[PDB]
Ligand SMILES: *[C@@H]1O[C@H](CO)[C@@H](O[C@@H]2O[C@H](CO)[C@@H](O)[C@H](O)[C@H]2NC(C)=O)[C@H](O)[C@H]1NC(C)=O
């Protein structure tokens with residue numbers, strides 16, 4: 001299928017209407033970031049030749 | 051099949067037709083002794099960086 005980018009949402013704009021929230025939600029979300037790699041070393045002579 | 055390593059007793063049970071053993075990286079880590087049919091575990095000699 002041809003993918004859909006998202007649901008249509010026509011915001012009810014006018015020149016004298018405002019939307020004010022009457023409530024709120026406390027949202028907690030995760031963000032995962034890699035920090036470090038595995039530290040490796042090579043004995044180059046031993047790898048190439050043994 | 052020659053190499054350098056530390057030969058130690060092993061709990062691995064080879065099938066009777068197998069002689070050598072390899073790990074996921076295809077390096078010989080276990081060998082069956084041809085004289086006495088006992089499986090010997092090969093550990094590389096403990097190298098390191100100074
Ligand atoms: C704001 O939203 C919260 C929920 O996020 C509302 O709290 C709920 O209220 C209903 C009915 O009053 C209860 O049945 C729920 O158990 C409540 N949930 C929680 C988590 O407390 C709250 O009433 C809303 N306030 C306004 C003014 O709309």
Ligand SMILES: *[C@@H]1O[C@H](CO)[C@@H](O)[C@H](O)[C@H]1NC(C)=O
Pocket residue numbers: 084085086087
């Ligand atoms: C080879 O000689 C050893 C020496 O004791 C013996 O134990 C073994 O049974 C012989 N035969 C084979 C097939 O290894």
